[PDB]
Design a protein around this nucleic acid. Structure first.
Ligand code: PAR
Ligand code: MG
Ligand code: MG
Ligand code: MG
Lengths: 88, 84, 211, 129, 63, 220, 51
RNA sequence: AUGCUGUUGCUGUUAAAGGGUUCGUAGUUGAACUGUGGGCUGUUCCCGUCCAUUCGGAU
RNA sequence: AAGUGUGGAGAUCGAAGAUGAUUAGAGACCAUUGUAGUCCACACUGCAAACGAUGACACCCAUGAAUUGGGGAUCCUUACGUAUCUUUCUCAGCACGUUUUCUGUUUUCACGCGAAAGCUUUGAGGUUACAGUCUCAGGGGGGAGUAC
RNA sequence: CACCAUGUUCAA
């Protein structure tokens, strides 16, 4: 249930587009710097599974230099990358 | 890194650097201290940025000297900062 | 990215791994400092060099490996180096992992000029430097290729997505980051097992001045 | 000098949201600028915000969730009759579907859609979409 | 609304009365789709051609 | 025949990418104009030349002259594309702008003014687009308005599938090189504005070159 | 063929790695580095020094 | 038609246009605060005891 | 700044002017002079490319060298790093080093903007997604900043 | 750093 409807409940628009996982910015069709990055979900023995976590970033965010700060902020939230060391 | 700044709850490293009015809640920089006279020995309460020259009420001497910032206490006097 | 869905400690740095990093000096940054790599610095040493946090080095190292291991058809990863010290390590990472590789002058239009016969379309670009590989990164900005980079302390991080912090300057330090990443991508695939040490020597990753 | 505190607050929200930030610090605050934000919470354009107590005017830290395009203030606060809502929707809103014009009425500070339903009029404060 | 029930049922009435809209079209959005040849078909020059009382449309305007 | 070089055109020729909105979803550059007339049906794709004007270069011993041709393409169902190429003969630049206009194909979001009752008659929000000084502003119009625009934006807005729209234009509209490309930039922004329909979280997909990476390696 | 020969003469490594000969004398880290290695979840590694 | 009189809605570095600088009345504009309440009932991992010593394990 | 009035001053440069020369001509440039002026006092004037060709007051605004004055230290972490050399009196001193922070004059550098050149926490940004406050001027080129 | 001034009217 996303995109505009008809008052008859049929999905009227073509192409519900992607949104940036950092900035919630709707990714346009010509935004050729916008990338998807698939991170492998891995198991208890350290070998990859058949499932991946995919996160997509808008093109202006990569253009400024702020994408690498955004990939960190996402993967801490998803639980992919640890935020600090454990205590010694 | 890996910890993002939270504007409501800023880091102690970030917040100790700030100007006193540029803090999230503004506050003093100064404090009071309990200054013992070099002779005479009686304690006085001297403000850290005392632009006036405070006198020892017992000793009759002046145990502080104003500066552009923190005032300078005389040589040979003992002082410990008071709380709050 | 040493956090798995179950909660195991399988990906975390060990005292054998971090002992290799200290020996190969791949935690010493240069004297200069940029804003975007400022979060990766632990502190500055005497003689003014920057020390990189080995946690954040290892977490961005495994994060780049969880992206490379999630690529069927590993030839869609292109790993490239315009600096001369990388070119031997780029070859050996491409050999064990099975990725495309390129060295030297990048020859602009490799990613955009589609009627060239040296026209490749990778899915993930791995650059050794964000600065000397400015041309590989700037064409990735045009055709939707995310970028993995071995960044030093002053790195221009426009268009770099997974910035790995290391010492990409010295001959031993480079190649140790490619050994350890090739060692890791093979572990995530399941080619080699995590118990025994990977027998393959690091020395072949080092560039050697053939004259 | 600062003249309108609400126009100050909405300008710093809108500026930091086009920069894609995660939080703003709004200074100074009022009763008006928190009643404007609670209209923007109810239709989910902002997140949770927090009013820090000085014994001065407060500060507000607003959590942004990427949904706000532009919030602004109409200055001066023009008087708006009930027949005038469709005139203000065509002027400052991008469409009739989404977007809200906030008014200060006798019944409170409300958006334009609620004030049309309760058959009231007010002075216009600002907009958000 | 009072000006749409009255006077919106008047404009649908004169479309149905003069043949501008057939009786299925009753929603008032069909007046916005009327064209100039929809009105020109209702002239007495056209029906006398369409009913069959004249060979051509220039025969009908003469008669 | 047409041998493709890009991976997207290999998947379009193999009918692995079936529709054109599967390219628009992943922000892929087209790079080959045979992708577009394969995916769009051949009778449901209209094109005609907007403007042709000559541009001259002063040289030693005279002027060089090449003709700059503007073409617009699109079925009238939410796809539009405009391309501008140049050439020494007027026949070459018209043919090159046809090649160029298909590469710049882009989708148009369309919506409703008042209530929603059928296919969308208008653009979903007020949008402007600026090239040079010429910025056109496109405003939603009611159900039976029509396109109210100058005849150069009106022909572009017909091919984009927009049926009822209000239009302004702020400065030096007699320059048609920038008037054409400002109607194009404004209709391109219609999928850039985040509305509360699209607030919901969508589950991520896989790239057609991610999914079909095993098939594309079999062309080598 | 001279490039295929010298690519085979170059890809030759000693039995002891240059990293295994580097630990076996001690890595000899700096002040700031050693002050960092106390903070880790693995502690300070074996075969280390402080210089 | 002309957002070429601009309240909506114009320009003012270089196209016409910020007045040499301050003070200054009429004028227009002007910081925060005294408050909109409450009760009931609906609506698999990881942390240690046996193995091993620049890379492991059963648990 | 030139200019004006009344007193001083009057070295040097020097509108006017005078001689040389160059030139087709030279009323100019160049050389030698030289008056008013230049300089001061007290009055008057109020005419600048009086410029950043950018009105004033607030707000938000990314980065890295510096510089001037003052002050202070040596699932979003509960905190931490200090050298140099001069030193019998405007000397519990002076300068420096590393780091904070306020005020000022700036520089190569992210958005964004602009017709562009360029601007960019010092906006010309935050503007057809057009309203923080006040103010001055402009409306094709002239005539003409003329006439009354 | 001697002197070195100018080229009728439309049009191509
Ligand atoms: O008031 C300052 C402000 O608080 C602070 N943000 C600072 O910004 C910089 C800081 O920049 C200046 O570098 C200058 C040295 O080259 C230094 O000036 C200072 O020099 C010291 C030595 N004379 C002081 O004694 C002096 O009082 C002081 N003016 C800084 O001001 C950089 O050093 C930092 N690396 C980064 C900060 N962001 O600048 C404001 C004034 O410019
Ligand atoms: Mg001469
Ligand atoms: Mg003389
Ligand atoms: Mg003559």
């Amino acid at each position: 249930t996303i995109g505009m409807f008809n008052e008859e409940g049929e999905n009227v628009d073509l192409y519900i587009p992607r949104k940036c996982h950092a900035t919630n910015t709707l990714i346009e069709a010509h935004d050729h710097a916008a990338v998807q990055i698939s991170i492998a979900n891995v198991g208890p023995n350290g070998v990859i599974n058949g499932t991946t976590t995919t996160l997509c970033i808008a093109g202006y965010l990569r253009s400024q230099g702020e994408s690498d700060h955004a990939i960190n902020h996402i993967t801490i939230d998803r639980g992919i990358m640890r935020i600090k060391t454990g205590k010694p | 890194g890996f910890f993002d700044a939270d504007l409501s709850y800023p880091t102690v490293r970030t917040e100790r650097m700030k100007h006193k009015r540029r803090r999230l809640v503004q506050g003093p920089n100064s404090y009071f201290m309990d200054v013992s006279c070099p002779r005479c020995r009686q304690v006085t309460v001297v403000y850290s940025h005392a632009t006036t020259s405070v006198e020892c009420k017992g000793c009759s001497k002046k145990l502080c000297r104003p500066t552009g910032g923190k005032a300078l206490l005389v040589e040979g006097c003992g002082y410990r900062r008071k709380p709050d | 990215m040493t956090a798995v869905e179950s909660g195991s400690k399988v990906l975390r740095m060990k005292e054998s791994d971090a002992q290799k990093l200290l020996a190969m000096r791949c935690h010493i940054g240069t004297r200069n400092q940029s804003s975007a790599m400022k979060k990766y610095i632990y502190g500055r040493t005497a003689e003014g060099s920057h020390i990189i946090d080995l946690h954040m080095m290892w977490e961005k190292l495994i994060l780049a490996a969880r992206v490379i291991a999630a690529v069927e058809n590993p030839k869609d990863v292109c790993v490239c180096s315009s600096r001369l010290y990388g070119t031997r390590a780029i070859y050996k990472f491409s050999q064990h992992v099975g990725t495309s590789f390129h060295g030297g002058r990048f020859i602009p239009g490799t990613f955009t000029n589609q009627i060239q016969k040296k026209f490749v379309q990778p899915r993930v670009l791995v650059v050794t430097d964000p600065r000397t590989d400015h041309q590989a990164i700037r064409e990735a900005s045009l055709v939707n290729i995310p970028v993995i980079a071995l960044c030093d302390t002053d790195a221009p991080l426009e268009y770099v997505d997974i910035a790995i912090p290391c010492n990409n300057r010295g001959i031993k330090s480079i190649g140790m980051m490619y050994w350890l990443l090739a060692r890791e991508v093979l572990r995530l695939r399941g080619t080699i097992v995590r118990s025994v040490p990977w027998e393959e020597k690091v020395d072949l990753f080092f560039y050697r001045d053939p004259n | 000098t600062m003249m309108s505190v609400l126009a100050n607050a909405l300008r710093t929200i809108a500026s930091a949201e086009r920069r894609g930030k995660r939080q703003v610090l709004i200074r100074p605050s009022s009763k008006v600028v928190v009643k404007f934000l609670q209209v923007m919470q109810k239709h989910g354009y902002i997140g949770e915000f927090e009013i820090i107590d000085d014994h001065r005017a407060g500060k507000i830290v607003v959590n942004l969730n990427g949904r706000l395009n532009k919030c602004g203030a109409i200055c001066p606060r023009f008087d708006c009759a009930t027949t005038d809502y469709e005139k203000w929707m065509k002027n400052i809103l991008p469409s009739r579907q989404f977007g809200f014009v906030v008014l200060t009425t006798s019944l409170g500070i409300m958006d334009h859609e609620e004030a049309r339903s309760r058959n009231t009029g007010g002075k216009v404060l600002g907009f958000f979409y | 609304h009072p000006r749409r029930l009255l006077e919106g049922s008047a404009i649908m009435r004169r479309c149905h009365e003069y043949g501008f809209l057939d009786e299925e079209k009753d929603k008032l959005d069909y007046v916005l789709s009327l064209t100039v040849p929809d009105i020109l078909e209702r002239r007495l020059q056209t029906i006398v051609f369409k009913a069959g009382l004249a060979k051509s449309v220039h025969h009908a305007r003469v008669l | 025949e047409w041998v493709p070089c890009t991976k997207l055109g290999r998947l379009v020729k193999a009918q692995k990418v079936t529709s054109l909105e599967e390219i628009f979803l992943f922000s892929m550059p087209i790079k080959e104009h045979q992708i577009v007339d394969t995916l769009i049906a051949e009778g449901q794709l209209h094109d005609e030349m907007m403007k042709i004007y000559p541009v001259q270069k002063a040289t030693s011993a005279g002027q060089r002259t090449r003709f700059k041709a503007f073409n617009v393409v699109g079925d009238c169902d939410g796809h539009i594309g405009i391309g501008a190429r140049v050439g020494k003969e007027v026949s070459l630049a018209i043919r090159a702008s046809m090649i160029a206009a298909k590469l710049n194909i882009v989708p148009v979001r369309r919506g409703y003014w008042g209530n929603k009752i059928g296919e969308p008659h208008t653009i979903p929000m007020k949008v402007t687009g600026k090239c040079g000084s010429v910025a056109v502003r496109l405003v939603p119009a009611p159900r039976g308005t029509g396109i109210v625009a100058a005849p150069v934006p009106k022909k572009i807005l017909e091919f984009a599938g927009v049926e009822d729209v209000y239009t302004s234009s702020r400065g030096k509209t007699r320059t048609h090189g920038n008037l054409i490309m400002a109607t194009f930039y404004a209709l391109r922004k219609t999928y850039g504005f985040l509305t509360p329909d699209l607030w919901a979280e969508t589950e991520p997909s896989r790239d057609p070159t991610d999914e079909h990476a095993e098939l594309l390696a079999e062309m080598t | 063929l001279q490039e295929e020969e010298r690519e085979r003469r170059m890809d030759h490594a000693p039995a002891t790695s240059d990293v295994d000969k580097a630990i076996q004398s001690g890595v000899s880290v700096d002040k700031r580095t050693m002050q960092m290695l106390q903070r880790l979840e693995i502690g300070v590694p074996r075969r280390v020094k402080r210089a």
